[PDB]
Symmetry: D3
């Protein structure tokens, strides 16, 4: 199959986290399919179909935990597969991939904006907000509250080992928002002064559990301890269909060298193992609301988002499997 360099490059950058953030990697994967379809030299629809299946698989095998990625792939590929199977000729199949890809990307952008608008209404003037990692959905919320003239301040946790909190701090400061920057260990110490916790998600399960950057569950735990609202900002495509039928979400284990750099780590004795999970699981008892582009829900309503929008696909195999 003649896979274009952009598919390989997108995949390499997902894997390396040069491109990162759950929504962003899903957009990048839709983009990569778009580009495969645009540049394809396929002459028959079967051949293009085969390229899009192979590209889809390469992109799926990058990072496991964030379901946004497979959900993007499926959005495009369910539509591509129904067209190929319904007889579409080459150019109709091509357009179906391109246009489906574009709709995913545009829907992602609008969803993040609307999550901002909805979540911002829950932020009040004077609020100290704590956040974790770098989530564009959570940021959209903070950014909009500040645009509305609420004087907020945000406690940003540094978020080891990849330091995504540095991204968040600089970003929020560039909008005019003051930031207090702390190490992850200090989240309980500062939870007394916090009014709200606003974080994002990689995958949300059928029972309401949120899988998000390593340490999220700790911040949620002590927020609950303190009666501080935990709000999770998350697009519908963050919801995980396979968990409706019992599937466990895989937690990505990333290279030990993100924790201890290579040159240091290679001097350490062999009876030290460095373990580097990229996510943890926050149970729904520690989440007050999830803010989707369709509104505020209790986390227990995750199953409804899943039923009404993804359940249908579960009797069928993946729309890229041959």
């Amino acid at each position: 199959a003649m896979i274009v360099k952009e598919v390989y490059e997108t995949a390499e950058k997902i894997k390396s986290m040069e491109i990162r953030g759950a929504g962003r990697i899903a957009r990048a994967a839709a983009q990569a399919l778009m580009i495969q379809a645009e540049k394809s030299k396929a002459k028959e629809p079967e051949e293009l179909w085969n390229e899009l299946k192979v590209a889809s698989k390469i992109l799926y095998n990058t990072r496991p935990t964030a379901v946004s990625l497979p959900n993007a792939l499926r959005y495009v590929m369910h539509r591509v597969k129904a067209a190929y199977l319904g007889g579409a000729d080459l150019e109709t199949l091509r357009f179906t991939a391109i246009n489906s890809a574009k709709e995913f990307i545009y829907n992602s952008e609008k969803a993040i904006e609307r999550i901002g608008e909805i979540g911002a209404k829950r932020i009040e003037d004077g609020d100290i907000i704590m956040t974790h990692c770098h989530s564009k959905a959570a940021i959209s919320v903070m950014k909009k509250a500040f645009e509305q003239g609420k004087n907020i301040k945000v406690i940003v946790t540094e978020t080891r080992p990849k330091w995504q909190g540095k991204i968040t701090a600089k970003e929020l400061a560039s909008y005019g928002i003051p930031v207090i920057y702390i190490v992850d260990s200090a989240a309980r110490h500062y939870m007394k002064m916090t009014d709200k916790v606003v974080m994002g998600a990689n995958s949300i399960t059928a029972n309401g559990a949120v899988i998000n950057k390593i340490g999220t569950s700790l911040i949620a735990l002590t927020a609950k301890e303190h009666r501080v609202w935990v709000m999770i900002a998350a697009e519908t495509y963050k919801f995980h269909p396979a968990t409706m039928l019992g599937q466990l979400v895989e937690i990505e284990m990333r290279d030990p060298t993100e924790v201890i750099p290579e040159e240091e780590l290679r001097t350490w004795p062999k009876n030290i193992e460095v373990w580097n999970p990229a996510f943890d699981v926050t149970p729904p008892e520690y989440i007050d609301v999830i803010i989707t582009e369709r509104g505020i829900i209790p986390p227990y309503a995750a199953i409804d988002i899943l039923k009404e929008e993804f359940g249908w696909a579960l009797k069928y195999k993946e729309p890229w499997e041959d």
Copy 2:
């Protein structure tokens, strides 16, 4: 007063944390007073007394949170003061300073060994133990358990910002103990597999609260959530006399460049502030036992350790005050 160079160097090295760990700095403070008295060229008792008073103030004004330091200074100087007020001559005042200091150091050392023998009886073969920062008292426990032939493994949290966890990981591994190194954020995620948590202390208050390295209270919180025993290995000189009469323990705020290196921080926007608390407060509800060199106590027995060993001094001014 003619303060010797070793007093100034010890003070600087406590301040910079080139010498750190609550028991160690307390021994170093006693050791500094020892050297002042050894080397003093005083010829009157009054002169040496005044030197030791000034030295004591220099040493006390280094780091505020660990009461181990003022307790060491008190141990030497209650004895020095009483000899002086009872009319000791120069050589008798001198020997009293030098010998009180050697006593403190020796008792510290024995206390740590003993804490280890006691706490190790609580550790069971097959145990996975989580720790935090680098506490000689907590290490004493684990090391003794390993030497008893218990096949243990220790999960070492990196302990941002100063990375004391690397000291711990390499020290335990060099004793032959298997280590799992993780970031602080991952403590909840790995609390299910943990059997025991063993951590140290800087100060322990009358109501049974434990002031220890930033992040301690989080680890304890989730250990309690998961019913994992929290054990705090701590010498009786970690107990904080002044909290008996209402005093709050100052939490040390250290330099922002410990979090974000100077070269990076100078480039960051002015509306970002970096907060770097060196300690937090773990309430007694999240502590199962305190292991002193006198035995296992519930945390609410802290007031008894204080009543029996320190209460009598509270009537008086500090033994270095004019």
Copy 3:
């Protein structure tokens, strides 16, 4: 612009709490619109439409916290607006107003009676029930259980500052129900002897939170503490549509002279402020069920009441807006 005196006097009575209780004020707003329409001297549809809009705004601007009042105005005005926009003539518009009003009013009465029947089934012979304030929906439950022959006693809390508890004590006693009357402060002391807690609601949010008379949340908290069932009796029009898109519910602050009479308060010094919140927020974790005219639900299905009945309307502006 030509608004009948009945609208003005209903408004004044809602505002002064001469007419109170969330259901009742909602019925009174419908009643007021009904009377504007019956008595209007308008000659074109336009004029009547402008009167109903204006009258609705007046009624809306009385008390903010109970969503029943705007849900009643919406019930009428959606229907009036649709008729008006579909070119309805004057008597068609008038009667759409009158009839819609009557319909809300009759459904309110029936909903309250049906909540009685459903809720009474959870009451058991010998039950001691605690309640708070004076809620017709909670009272419907208690009255029905007693009419079924269950020997219950009701602990009535006095409900400062407006003493609604007195209304409830006398009302329940009038039906032959034995009453125990206590101050609000005594709710914990008597929670051990309580078998069920039954209270009303002013607004219920998308995430399952209940906004009800100041003090409800304390009762619910110690109820949950003691594993006593907390049941909230509430018509579907107590559910709050705007909270689906992030709106916060405003807590009415009423006159401090309801707390300290004017004659006494004028004598007090300026450095005492009296704060008089009329409602508090009870989180869903401390509510076992809501009893609506459609059934028993967990507090987390509030969002399904909203989606199924009100969600459609969030697309559009309030039906009384221009």
Copy 4:
């Protein structure tokens, strides 16, 4: 009515628990109605209808707690009733009873297999699973997990007074699964080593409460204390329609001689009473998921299973009532 012998024998055998387990008795009840219709010597539709009505009452008055039984009877008799009221002739009424019953039995069987496939995805290699009583739905899960090659061990609680745990221990062991048998009292003691708890259900209520074998709520409580996942494997026909409109589930009180054998009890003093509740109530807070043949749900989604499959019948009388 000429009720056949198999109806009476099935009723007696449900009463005595020679046939027990909530799914099994439901199938046996359907199977009894099947045999009544097969063997009936009725010649009018009216006559067979009246037989099936009487049979249904006999079967329903056996054990009250497991709603699986009346749900089975409803499944057959809604269909029988509608055929009769629509003027079915004898053979058409007959086949409708026999075929509705075969459908119920088949769907039950498939539902259990499916619950097993789904729940098994939640079980992980190395898992220690605790169970209670003898639930075919819970066993389906464990058995499928074992057949997937997951090396599991099951802790089986003896389940006094009727000792259903011995049935479970021998059944699991005969599939090749390692078993640890303990007394019910030892469930807390062994909850630290347990990874997962998997139990069945007799009835599940609108608010998400689970009524299952006496002791269930205790096991769930301590599983929650210890953060051990509680999974309730339960077919949709375990969900209890009438709780939607307020009904409480009767807890069956069985004979004291199940606890203390007659030969011993007759010798005991008159001021000792033996209480033998066959079930308790586990609140939804102590349940992580319910595994239905339609998927994993949070317990608060019980109201949705009821709304979508059973709500419509609540308007009508039982389909066996005059």
Copy 5:
């Protein structure tokens, strides 16, 4: 038998709550014994002894719940009794009564002032403090913190039924302290903004439980809920010796007309009963410290206050008994 009118009128005033507050009523009982002794017309030791015994019984039988009152009578009477039994003459006995009284009175004043000083050290600049009722010991803390220049505000709960909150609001405002006055029901709504809770005590038991004005326990509960410090300010003579040997503390039930004035209550029907408990019980789990004149203790060291100061006396009968 010859009891001076001062004893009778002190008793009547204690009983009617014209003299109230646990410390104050204790000082007034001592004062009453002092005056019996100064004014006695007895001529033998025997006669004075019989008067002091009788006068003590009268004073004891006023209000039951605050142990301060019997601890004051014991302070005097142990000393009088020992003197009398060691053959003291008339003026030796008289003066032992008078002097012992004066001594209790002076120590009470000093204890309250010392609690102020110790407790103020836990108050911090900017603190919002919630309190309940009117406790001189809690007020001592708040007043001292303000005198130290800390800018505090105090939330004062009204404390139905006797409105002690009004005494406290006016008193605190008189010292220049800003006050916020709320109904008791509003304590949860305002707990988020509260930094510390500071309340008094009537009796403290061997296990650490605090008996204080009706409603204290609800405040402490939601304080603990919100991780707000709960501090109890209480002299050593609030500790209850008889609870060491299992005694329960009696909860005074006062006249229902304190709740509903007579003029209104006579009009109410017989089937409403008004219950008026003057105190509730706060378990030690919801108290962080007790502040006594001897220091800060965890609530679980109440038993050590008792053993060290009162335990000796449990051997013998009350010193006023025959």
Copy 6:
């Protein structure tokens, strides 16, 4: 060493649980030493000393978990050892053993009575009390409350696998106390109607934990859940000195045949293991008071009982070790 048959027989009966109950086995062990000393044919003190050491070891090696046993042995043997070592002749050594044994036995009887008197004061008229196993200390409490004329009723759990609850039921009924008898699984179900939980102890540790019959920890857990007082009735000799220095208490694992009788168990396949722990650990957070013969303490004061009465012996080896 010439060990009398009574020592061997006492040991056999301890091991078999023909003699059982923590206090009773300690009395029986003191008795066995008494009898060895009375019947000894020793001619020199060294020879008698050697017999008493050997008997002590035989009795120590019966059952591990209840510390009452070693504490009895030590009470006698500390005194025997001080006499042998201080030169006592044969007959003085003999008398020292006999008389020390008698003092232990008499002190045990008085302690149980006094625990009754003290605990009974905490029981109120109308109380429903739940208990577990058969504890003479807990029974003394119930028996005395009933003798005082309190109308109590006791819920007795059957206590698998040895059925000690049958002993308790019959015993309490023989005093006139009504009993409700339940299986252990039903303790949560009936905790709503319970006022108090009163249980005994085998060993109480330095941190306040209570080791008691298997299932105790479960009853305590749900009692705490329900705000039902947990009272532990326990003699000072139930307190475990070695835990002061870190020792873990061994949990006795008894024969599987107590759970499943031999003839049944031998037909079961080898991949079923029966596990039969005789005790569990109840953490001090689930105990409100321990009632000793010296009074009511919080469980956290266990360390005080240990310090003041047993600490002294810990620098020395066991008084029977050679």
